Structures are given as C-alpha cells and as structure tokens.
Design a binder for this molecule. Structure first.
Ligand SMILES: [Mg+2]
Ligand SMILES: [Mg+2]
Lengths: 197, 197
C-alpha cells in the first residue's frame, strides 16, 4: 500500500514545479483572439497552420519561459506527507542552491531536511541510481520501502535501478506500465490515492 | 523591391535552423499510435488530456531536443542569394564558434565571410541595434538597404531599431504588421517572393 511508504523522494522540474510562459507574447505571436483559449484555438486551425504555430511555440519554449510555479497539488501533497512525519527527499539535476531557493519560493523549504535535498553536485544524473542509494543509506532504509516520484521516464528508470517503488505524475495515463508502480494525473490525485488506498 | 536589397542578415535559431526532437520518445510518453501523426492525434483527444499532454511536451522541450536541422528552404535561399553575389551576414546569440560549426554542418559556411558572422561576443543581444549597425558600417551601406530576417519579435525590433528592413519567416501569417516589411511562411516562400517581386 502507498500509505505504507514513509520515505518519499521527489523530482523537481515537471513534478513539484512547472515552467510558466508569457501568455501575452504567445497570443500576440500566434494571433490568438482574447476570447479564445490558446490550445483550443490552435487545435481548431487548419492542420498546416496549427502545425506551424505549435512548432514555433516549441522552438521558442525557453524564450517564452518566465520561471516556474508549483505544480497542481504539489504543495498540498508535500505538506500532507510532512504532516505525517514522513521522511522526504529531492533528487534534482538543479544545483542545490537553486533547488533551495525554489523550495523557499513555493513554501516547502521546511518540509525537507537540507541534507536530503540532492542536486547536481550530490548525485549523478538520472537514471543513475546513486542519489536514491545515497538517501536510502542516509535514512537506513530498504529501497523497497521508498518511492521515487517523477514525471519523466528517467525518474522511473532511476527508481527501478535503485530498487525503489516509482510514481508517475503530471501525465493523464500510464505510458510506462512496467516502470510505474502508481500513476496519477497530478500530485493532487496522488494525495487522494494515498488517502484511499 | 526585395530583389533590390543586396545586403542580408539572418538570425540563426528558428530562422536558418530549427530544433529537432526525439519523435519515438514523444510517441511513447504521450501514447501516440504508430499510425497517427503526433499533433493530429493530440488535437483529437479530449481537451483535458490534450492540454495535459501538450503542457508536458512543452515542459520537456529541452529534454527531448536532438540538435537542429536546416529550416525549410533555408539552404536554398542562402545559396540563391550567395549565387547573386549578395553580401550575407548573421546576427545570433550563439557563440561565434558554435555558429560556425552549425553553418558547416548545414553546408552554408562558404556563403558567409567569417567576419560577417556576429555571435554572443561580437554584438549585444537583440533587440539592441549594435550588431546590425556593425554590419552596416563594415559593409559601408545605409541600413535602409539591408534586410534583417528572423522569426521572433526581437529580430524585427532589432531591425527597426537599427533602421534596416525586416522579414518574418517561419510563421504562416503576419502577427506584427508594423514591425514587418515582408513576411513568408518559410525561407522557400521568401525565395519565391524574391524571384517574383
Ligand atoms: Mg522531471
Ligand atoms: Mg530566432
């Protein structure tokens, strides 16, 4: 049962936080009417114009980015787990300092012990198991009793390599069934699963 | 007339080259059937699943990127202009060395004099006019007789600031009419415009 796992490890980008983008710049560049939602409008254009505009959006993802915000239900999930006294960690490609700043920004800095936030300098890149093995050792716990929560195949591969359980969030379905122990559309639904199962 | 302009300056990313992405990874992550085109499939999903999957694609643009390839008609346009004996330049945020490598990769290194490829270290970031002013001076030409070709508002703003003519490519329409002297869906159509007008 998911509620039996008391040691949780989170990816950051795409899991606890998501990139936000300049909506007004997007609307101007792609000629979206104010009364239309961006994606709904693009989906309704002729296929060739839709493809061209989507390709442009993707090409300029970084130009249009404006930092990040908490992913849906992420703050809620982490606070729920922290409230249970569970042990929480982070395994991110970000530098530890930046991860720290982000955690403070989204109001979750107090939910993770500083030593349990592993960044660029503390662990090899996913899907290398190193970071999870480090946490498992620091926590004196079997990996089979930890869960790795992520949104990308490398997060799941990392969990499988280290031997932890794995959770996919922030996709609506189950694209890697064999790599994925639990899946939820987002952290809010994951919190619901935790509560029910 | 466009054919009267004999001094042309190109942006790189999004104009002469475009990022390519890992199609197989995308298809696996978003559960796209082999017989479906990715975008057409997403456009046909329920709106909520479509939005979630598009947001994921955008969030992982850099994870899914696999270098770049020539933009449609770009090699053809540059060779056509070089063949006319026109003077050609580049104004890119990329380091000059990388711009050089890219130009070699796509077979256009011989179309630009090395001194006329301005990168990170040779010119301030768009939309600062500096890079175009530098080329105009090096070429002993009035900016009104140069054209800046780009795919982003900053390219057009840069041209307007320096006083060059401006061209938008790689969007299908005309989102910044006042900033844009000519627009074309891509470099191939731009070559056609050049030929006809
Ligand atoms: Mg991630
Ligand atoms: Mg560009």
């Amino acid at each position: 049962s998911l509620s039996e796992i008391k040691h949780w490890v989170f990816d950051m980008d795409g899991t606890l936080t998501i990139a936000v983008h300049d909506f007004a710049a997007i609307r101007e560049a792609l000629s979206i009417p104010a009364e239309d939602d961006i994606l709904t409008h693009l989906a309704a254009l002729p296929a060739d114009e839709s493809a061209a505009k989507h390709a442009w959006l993707l090409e300029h993802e970084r130009d249009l980015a404006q930092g990040s915000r908490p992913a849906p239900g992420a703050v809620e999930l982490v606070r729920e787990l922290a409230g249970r006294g569970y042990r929480l960690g982070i395994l991110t490609r970000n530098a530890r300092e930046l991860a720290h700043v982000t955690l403070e920004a989204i109001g979750l800095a107090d939910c993770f012990a500083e030593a349990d936030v592993l960044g660029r300098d503390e662990a090899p890149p996913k899907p290398h198991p190193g970071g999870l093995l480090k946490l498992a050792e620091a926590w004196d716990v079997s990996p089979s009793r930890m869960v790795m929560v992520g949104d990308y195949r490398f997060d799941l591969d990392c969990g499988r390599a280290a031997g932890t359980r794995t959770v996919l969030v922030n996709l609506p379905d189950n694209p890697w069934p064999e790599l994925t122990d639990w899946h939820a559309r987002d952290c809010a639904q994951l919190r619901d699963l935790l509560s029910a199962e």
